[PDB]
Amino acid sequence: LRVELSDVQTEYYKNILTKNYSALTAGAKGGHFSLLNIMNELKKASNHP
DNA sequence: GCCGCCCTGGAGAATCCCGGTGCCGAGGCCGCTCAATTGGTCGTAGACAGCTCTAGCAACCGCTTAAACGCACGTACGCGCTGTCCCCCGCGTTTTAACCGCCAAGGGGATTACTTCCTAGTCTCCAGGCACGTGTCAGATATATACATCC
């Protein structure tokens, strides 16, 4: 069963794939986003934001 | 009538202020002058691309087991109080040497300019030392088997 993505999933996917550390931080107080293992973060974004 | 004592006024000298002129610190100007700038040439340091192989990383598993953690108890030590005595501090007095200003000549060392030559950079060629891989060999280790012996 192939299902589409939400808007949050799509914006997280384009933020990870076109790396946007300033945009990926946004409202986070810590701001510690790790983009080592890009494809694992892509799978995490495809599963749940 | 003559002589001595108290009260009050104007002129001579000291002081504050201002102007003209000379001296100290600093900045503008000028002159030398050597090092930064400009322009041109060329070699190569590094950026870029490409392929191969190994380490790291996120997130999960499973097993073991030793380290971590929590708790209770107990007692040793940190800490506070008190005494005591001794040694350091404050002060007065006396000494003394640091400090500054002086010879007296001479050598050491910093510059400026010059000469010379030995030695280290550079280039070319070559060979052997270092790094890596492997065959072989002697010392260390484990067991197979035979002989003396106690029950």
Q: Is the dihedral of CA A37, A38, A44, A49 positive or negative?
A: positive
- Tell me the CA–C1' distance in angstroms for A12 and B2: 140
Considering only CA atoms, which of A27, A23, A4 is closest in space to residue A12? A23
Query: Amino acid identity of A33?
Result: F
Nearest residue to B59 via alpha carbon and C1': A40
Is the CB atom of residue A39 positioned under 7 angstroms from any atom of strand B?
Answer: no
- Tell me the CA–C1' distance in angstroms for A9 and B87: 83
In degrees to the nearest 10, what's the CA dihedral of A33, A39, A40, A43? 110
